[PDB]
C-alpha cells in the first residue's frame, strides 16, 4: 500500500474513515445492543472515541494515549485499546452492560 496506517487499522472494531453520524447509524443498523466501535477523535488529535450501544442510546467514551505507550479511559490505564475492550467484555462499562459484538469496519 505504501501507507503508514493508524496502529489500529485492520482491527475489526476500528473505523478510521467514518463520521460520527455514520457511527450512530451503523450501531443502530448493523449493530445490536451492546455493540461497539472505535473512531479517531474528531476534536482532540491523537485521541480515540469508543461508541457503545445501550438499550436506549449510544454512549461515547474518550481514550487518550499517555507519553509511554499506554491508553487512559475512565481514569484507568491500559497497554492497548484491545486491552480496554478485553476489560469491558468482563467488567461492566455502563451499569447493566458489557461490551459484546464489534461493528465490523464496512
Amino acid at each position: 500500500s505504501g501507507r503508514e496506517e493508524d496502529p489500529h487499522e485492520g482491527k475489526i472494531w476500528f473505523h478510521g474513515k467514518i463520521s460520527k453520524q455514520e457511527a450512530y447509524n451503523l450501531l443502530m443498523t448493523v449493530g445490536q445492543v451492546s455493540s461497539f466501535l472505535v473512531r479517531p477523535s474528531d476534536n482532540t488529535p491523537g485521541d480515540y472515541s469508543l461508541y457503545f450501544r445501550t438499550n436506549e442510546n449510544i454512549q461515547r467514551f474518550k481514550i487518550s494515549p499517555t507519553p509511554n505507550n499506554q491508553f487512559m479511559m475512565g481514569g484507568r490505564y491500559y497497554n492497548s485499546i484491545g486491552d480496554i475492550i478485553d476489560h469491558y467484555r468482563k467488567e461492566q462499562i455502563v451499569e447493566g452492560y458489557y461490551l459484546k459484538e464489534p461493528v465490523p469496519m464496512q
Binding site: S49, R60, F61, K62, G74, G75, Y88, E91, Q92
Partner: peptide, 8 residues
C-alpha cells in the same frame, strides 16, 4: 461531551 464508565 463524553460519558464516564461505571468503574471510572
Amino acid at each position: 461531551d463524553y460519558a464516564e464508565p461505571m468503574d471510572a
